[PDB]
């Protein structure tokens, strides 16, 4: 809403219901913790394109969403688990130095 | 210097480790067969 | 560093690879056709140094037989038989490939267990194309003779009707177009005087038939009719010994590619739906639509009509192709439950990517041709968020939906701050992932009395990570050739004696090391045959 954050701390809320599996939604955010006032659904419909942009929510059949499996991942498409040593070993592979 | 890496950097796995083998051989036989 | 990271496109790594295995005296010459598109020997000779007449004729006959160039034969009028020499490009992708050929055989030939031509069968590999060209008696003129090779010999039928073992032409020795050339006046050896008007109708007539030609001299290496001899006497089948005959990679491509297009299942799905889809590919790629698509690699492709054409008839094939489209009922058997055939492709048909969609109902096929464009889009956006920070990847999605993007609506539209966003933003026009369009509000285009807008351009952002690929390959050969310039002396002692104690420990760290190099080679390929399905 405001300019300043707290509104990815508001989002990380909204993302739990789904992953077990867009007036639904408006029932599920409303509870003690919330504060923001008045959480109109034309910020609802905003705020649920973000998680499409991070990958983390899927947008079907005009109003439905569903996740991702993005939660598995939370925890070769897997770049965690994946350490570089980078010291001592001068064969490395960079994204820079070519241009 | 340059910064900004690949994130493909790890240990080499036994499943390509006998993988890797096949390529030194290769040449091997290559520049000890005919040219 | 720098001497390389600048000045060198893909011809250091073309160079490299005949530097890697490969005497040194080609390197250069297979440098100067890239470097000059088209040359002869008679100006071969001037444009080198260093090498004779006669000395090129023995050298050119080494990477002829490895099918590193192909050929090609013009007379004039006037002039005598001129040898015009082109180049190849997916004859030293062997060459390039050569260690994961030796892993398809293993991992598609799955009906062995516990073999005893396990070293055998991976030496084939090692013969049929590291030799050159190989022919049946070849191998049986062998240190062994007979010693039991019917098992081997009937073997290699298995091996060579599961495909890519197909009989050598000059269709292989030659490229594509300079044939072309020959079959289209082929197609126009009309006297004019015969129906002279229309005459735009006269190339259309020339054109029709000439493409009813180049798809049948298309099937001539897959003319599987004569690639093999009924035997009447003490063998069941056998090809014939009389063909020569070399691996190519068009299963290996396509073997690559389904071998690629599992890798989305183990993240749209769980483990166990990714299990049943590797069944439900690996009976299409025996006969599947051409992923390098040979007919459209130079012709009418420049005229919109033509180019409508190209895709009009390649959807048709692959909608009503006989030798993919499975009848969703056979495969419950090759699994190692009916209801569970129509409950596990169900999520096929609710997933958001275009794999088996569209279909007579009942029946299922693949879809090909609206697929890997996603799967190009797919890798290639996560790319982005792997090496800088993932605010880059809101910022990449935000794109192609928001078409021509302000920096008025990206706050509408994504959430972050003022301060991180011009930082990332930046860091990816420098990437070109983004194509900046100025607009002006003055006269001769004032840049202060101006805005700007944003564009994805799915083009020159896909075009720019290939290259940044291809040079990343050979930079890790280029690394590999100066590890054996260097220690160079105990290698010969150690390549001389098929000991001295302490000598022993610098044999294993340069060992180890480059170990390392075959492995990460192995993972950038992969990152780079996805972008070639073009």
Redesign the interface.
């Given at each position: 809403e405001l300019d300043i954050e707290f509104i990815n701390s508001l989002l990380t809320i909204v993302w739990r219901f789904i992953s077990e599996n867009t007036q639904e939604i408006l029932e599920f955010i409303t509870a003690a913790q919330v504060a923001n006032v008045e959480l109109t659904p034309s910020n609802i419909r905003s705020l649920c394109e973000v998680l499409v942009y991070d990958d983390k929510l899927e947008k079907v059949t005009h109003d439905c969403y569903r996740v991702t499996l993005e939660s598995i991942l939370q925890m070769?498409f897997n770049?965690f688990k994946?350490?570089?040593?980078?010291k001592h070993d001068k064969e490395?592979?960079?994204?820079?130095?070519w241009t | 210097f340059?910064?900004?890496?690949?994130?493909?950097?790890?240990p080499?796995?036994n499943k390509?480790?006998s993988?890797?083998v096949?390529?030194?051989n290769?040449?091997k036989?290559?520049?000890d067969?005919?040219? | 560093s720098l001497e390389q990271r600048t000045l060198n496109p893909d011809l250091f790594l073309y160079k490299e690879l005949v530097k890697?295995?490969?005497?040194e005296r080609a390197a250069s010459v297979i440098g100067m056709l890239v470097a000059l598109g088209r040359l002869s020997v008679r100006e071969l000779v001037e444009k080198i140094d260093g090498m004779d007449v006669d000395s090129v004729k023995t050298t050119l006959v080494?990477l002829t037989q490895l099918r590193c160039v192909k050929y090609l034969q013009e007379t004039a009028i006037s002039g005598k038989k001129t040898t015009y020499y082109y180049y190849n490009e997916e004859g030293i992708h062997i060459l390039l490939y050569?260690?994961?050929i030796?892993?398809e055989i293993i991992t598609q030939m799955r009906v062995n267990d516990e073999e005893e031509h396990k070293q055998l069968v991976?030496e084939i590999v090692?013969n049929v194309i590291?030799?050159g060209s190989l022919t049946v008696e070849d191998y049986l003129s062998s240190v062994t003779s007979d010693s039991m090779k019917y098992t081997i010999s009937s073997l290699f039928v298995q091996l060579c009707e599961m495909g890519y073992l197909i009989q050598i032409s000059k269709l292989h020795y030659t490229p594509i177009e300079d044939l072309w050339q020959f079959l289209y006046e082929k197609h126009y050896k009309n006297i004019p005087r015969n129906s002279p008007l229309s005459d735009l109708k006269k190339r259309s007539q020339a054109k029709m038939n000439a493409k009813t030609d180049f798809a049948k001299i298309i099937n001539k290496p897959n003319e599987l009719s004569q690639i093999l001899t009924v035997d009447p006497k003490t063998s069941l089948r056998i090809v014939k010994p009389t063909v020569s005959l070399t691996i190519n990679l068009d299963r290996f491509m396509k073997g690559r590619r389904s071998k690629q297009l599992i890798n989305l299942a183990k993240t749209r799905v769980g483990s166990v739906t990714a299990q049943v889809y590797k069944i439900a590919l690996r009976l299409t790629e025996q006969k599947s639509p051409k992923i390098r698509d040979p007919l459209t690699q130079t012709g009418l492709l420049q005229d919109l009509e033509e180019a409508k054409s190209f895709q009009d008839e390649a959807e048709l094939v692959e909608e009503k192709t006989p030798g993919l489209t499975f009848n969703a009922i056979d495969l419950a058997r090759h699994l190692p439950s009916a209801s569970l055939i129509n409950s596990h492709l169900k999520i096929l048909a609710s997933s958001n990517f275009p794999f088996l969609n569209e279909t007579k109902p009942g029946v299922y096929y693949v879809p090909y041709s609206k697929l890997m464009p996603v799967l190009k889009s797919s890798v290639y956006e996560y790319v982005i968020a792997?090496?800088?920070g993932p605010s880059a990847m809101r910022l990449s999605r935000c794109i192609r939906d928001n078409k021509l993007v302000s920096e008025k609506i990206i706050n509408s539209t994504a959430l972050m701050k003022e301060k991180d966003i011009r930082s990332t933003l930046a860091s990816l026009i420098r990437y070109n992932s983004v194509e900046i369009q100025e607009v002006p509000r003055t006269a001769d285009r004032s840049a202060s009395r101006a805005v700007f807008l944003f564009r994805c351009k799915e083009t020159h952002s896909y075009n720019f990570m290939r290259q940044n690929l291809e040079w990343?390959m050979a930079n890790l050969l280029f690394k590999k050739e100066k590890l054996k310039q260097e220690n160079s002396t105990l290698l010969k002692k150690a390549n001389r004696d098929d000991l001295l104690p302490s000598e022993l420990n610098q044999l294993k760290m340069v060992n180890e090391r480059?170990?390392?190099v075959?492995?990460?080679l192995?993972?950038?390929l992969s990152?780079w045959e996805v972008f070639q399905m073009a």
């Open positions: 070769i770049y994946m350490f570089p040593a980078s490395v592979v960079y994204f820079d130095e | 340059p910064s900004i890496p690949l994130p493909i950097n790890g080499i796995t390509e480790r993988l890797a096949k390529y030194i290769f040449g036989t290559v520049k067969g005919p040219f | 890697a295995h490969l005497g080494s050569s260690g994961l030796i892993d991976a090692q590291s030799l792997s090496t800088l990343n480059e170990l390392n075959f492995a990460r192995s993972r950038l990152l």
